[PDB]
Amino acid sequence: MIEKAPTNVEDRDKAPHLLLLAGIQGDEPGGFNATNLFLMHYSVLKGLVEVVPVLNKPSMLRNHRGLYGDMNRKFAALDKNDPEYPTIQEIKSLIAKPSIDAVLHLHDGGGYYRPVYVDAMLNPKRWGNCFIIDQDEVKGAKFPNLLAFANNTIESINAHLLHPIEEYHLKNTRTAQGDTEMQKALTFYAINQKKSAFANEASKELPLASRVFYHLQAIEGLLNQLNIPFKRDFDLNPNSVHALINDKNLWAKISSLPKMPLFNLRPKLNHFPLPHNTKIPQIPIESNAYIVGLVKNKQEVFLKYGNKLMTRLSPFYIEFDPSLEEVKMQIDNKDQMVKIGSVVEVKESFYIHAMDNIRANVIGFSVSNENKPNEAGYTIKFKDFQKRFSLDKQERIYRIEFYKNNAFSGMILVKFV
Ligand SMILES: [Ca+2]
Ligand SMILES: [Ca+2]
Ligand SMILES: [Ca+2]
């Protein structure tokens, strides 16, 4: 859970609290890209929005509806030994917190829901583009009138339709009156804790940016009903959403390595240093996005951003010796100390000063066929690189790797600008 909170802690109790969740199915990227963009680009000014951007991260990493079965059928009866049991308890505890008032759960769904049968794509059994409640009223909730809230949220969404077929409709699943097998989902659990709970479906028939657009419209519609004041730093239209999903300023930082751009990496990065003795899901990974991760695939390690494959790492596992903190480098004739893990911009040249006990391998530069070269003490320019070794498709970013005996001492990237 990540908090979207006012800057003044005192403002947290001055409006309602919403819990916003997505990605309970790992192949529903509209939901988890919406929670991502909300975390990255919105501000909450009073009250609080608690966000679990992806409920089923292992499944997301494999572009899969649910590696351990349908996680959204696990909120009622559940075997204590179910692999998702611990996760389910964490989620139920968030839902049932006294400080939470409302719950919004995002999904992507086939076709377009209609309350009367129109055709195979548009009918009451389809799920796309509807706003869903379990029943019209939850007695004892802060906001018991789920129907009024839903109808008003639907008004907001429907003021912004991209095409008439995308019109949102209310779906009331009357869950408590239905079969036992229909009562196993997240929002029904939530209403049983006297929370107002809603699900938003965006149609799987839409491109990703349009799915995310509709999720964001539903989030904004509901925040307006709850009187949780907010801002965003962009205009909400599909082009603008697309631009932010596909933002060139997105980065990932693996372990103690430098930040790397997410987009336009080469599709495969070879001899890529990773810490040894560390299970892939335990390798530290930081990003300015909230849906980035690593996952093993055969002997490769995939860098995932939601369902998007950003690169395939071909790793070599090695001890990450943390002793080396900085390196004396000359950049465009200007001598300086460069921190291990940095990205440095180079207009013309660089030069690494020689070090006792440390060997530098500039990846893409060579002066011999030596397998473990020391390339400190060379003045290096763009023309000296075999471009195929660049980190990026643009052939501008190169790795410098440092070694102390048989251990890895760190990496610095150079970016030719
Ligand atoms: Ca922004
Ligand atoms: Ca779903
Ligand atoms: Ca080299």
Numbering used by the authors: 22 to 438
What's in the article?
To provide the structural basis for understanding the molecular function of H. pylori Csd4, we have determined its crystal structure in three different states: (i) a ligand-free form (Csd4-unbound), (ii) a substrate-bound form (Csd–muramyltripeptide) complexed with the synthetic peptidoglycan fragment NAM-tripeptide (NAM-l-Ala-γ-d-Glu-mDAP) and (iii) a product-bound form (Csd4–mDAP) complexed with mDAP, one of the two products. Since the crystallization reservoir solution contained calcium chloride, we have assigned the three metal ions as Ca2+. Therefore, our crystallized enzyme with a Ca2+ ion in the active site is a noncompetent variant. The anomalous difference map clearly showed that this metal ion is not Zn2+ in the Csd4-unbound crystal. Among the three structures of Csd4, the β9–α5 loop region (residues Thr196–Ala206) containing two 310-helices exhibits the largest structural variation. This region is moved towards the active site in the Csd4–muramyltripeptide and Csd4–mDAP structures when we compare them with Csd4-unbound. The side chain of Arg94 interacts with the flap via a strong salt bridge with Glu202 in all three structures. It points towards the active site in both the Csd4–muramyltripeptide and Csd4–mDAP structures, whereas it points away from the active site in the Csd4-unbound structure. Csd4 exists as monomers in the crystals, as the largest surface areas buried at the interface between two neighbouring monomers within the crystals are 502, 467 and 481 Å2 per monomer (2.7, 2.5 and 2.6% of the monomer surface area) for the Csd4-unbound, Csd4–muramyltripeptide and Csd4–mDAP structures, respectively.
